[PDB]
Design a protein around this ligand. Structure first.
Ligand code: 1N1
Length: 270
């Protein structure tokens, strides 16, 4: 959906992306009220291949419509600079948002965030889309604490960017078989990131140390104050046999049960 350049106002540069700046702005189109948008720009000095990779994210995002998936507003391609516009997520990336707010949200709030992420993933799996880079740094958060999946692209990993080892299921590392079940492994890592308020998975371990540890049956321990039932769900996501892991509909169901029976979240390890 091509957007007339005159409908777009850039207000402030708010971050740095893979291909250039990330901005906050306003979109005002005839017959519609003004709305806030995030804007990524691609400025001159790039290869034609880079332009396609940049715009591919908009093509893929535009295939989806779900409250926990970032919404595309449109693109600017018949003019320079090239732009992609989405809904504006006032709290930015989830991992840094939680680090800024360490210990300041309740267990029930954290579970609600995890439920939104799992609902977005349930939708992607139903659409036969495998994310491959599910991580808290790729979840965006709005003013109401709603969490939405971002970072869309179908390009192969370098070995087939590099494979994100700490988030990746062991069969995907070893054999490059990426499936919704490998995204479930990654989702378990995201759960650990959320319940630890943005700690780095596996701390200072090297990538090869992580690979070897997982093969030797190590799994991340419960974060401080984490309900045991949430850590058990993490362990279920981290089963070595991909066919034994829960599927995303089952994950959403488990989180919904916790929200409805919050007394079950009181048990914590000693
Ligand atoms: C970098 C950043 N993004 C924010 N919100 C975003 N919403 C949507 C974004 C976005 O990337 N969409 C998008 C995607 C996903 C793909 C292609 C194209 C596009 Cl356009 S980025 C907020 C933010 N903050 C800075 C720090 N704090 C403020 C100061 O205290 C909190 C807020 N920082």
């Amino acid at each position: 959906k091509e957007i007339d350049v005159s409908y777009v106002k850039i207000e402030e540069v708010i971050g740095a992306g893979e291909f250039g700046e990330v901005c906050r702005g306003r979109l005002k189109a005839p017959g519609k009220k003004e709305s806030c948008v995030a804007i990524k720009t691609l400025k001159g000095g790039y290869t034609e291949r880079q332009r396609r990779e940049f715009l591919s994210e908009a093509s893929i995002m535009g295939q989806f419509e779900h409250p926990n998936i970032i919404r595309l507003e449109g693109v600017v391609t018949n003019s320079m600079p090239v732009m992609i516009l989405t809904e504006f997520m006032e709290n930015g990336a989830l991992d840094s948002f939680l680090r800024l707010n360490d210990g300041q949200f309740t267990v029930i709030q954290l579970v609600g965030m995890l439920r939104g992420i799992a609902s977005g993933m349930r939708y992607l799996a139903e659409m036969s889309y495998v994310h491959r880079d599910l991580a808290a740094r790729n979840i965006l958060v709005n003013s109401n604490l709603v969490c939405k999946v971002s970072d869309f692209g179908l390009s192969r990993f370098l070995e087939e960017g590099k494979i994100p080892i700490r988030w990746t299921a062991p069969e995907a590392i070893a054999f490059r078989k990426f499936t919704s079940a490998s995204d479930v492994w990654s989702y378990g890592i995201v759960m650990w990131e959320v319940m630890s308020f943005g700690e780095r998975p596996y701390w200072d371990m090297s990538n090869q140390d992580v690979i070897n540890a997982i093969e030797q049956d190590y799994r991340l321990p419960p974060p401080p104050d984490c309900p045991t039932s949430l850590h058990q769900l993490m362990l279920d996501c981290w089963q070595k046999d991909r066919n034994a892991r829960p599927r995303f509909p089952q994950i959403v169901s488990a989180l919904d049960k916790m929200i409805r029976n919050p007394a079950s979240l009181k048990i914590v390890a000693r």
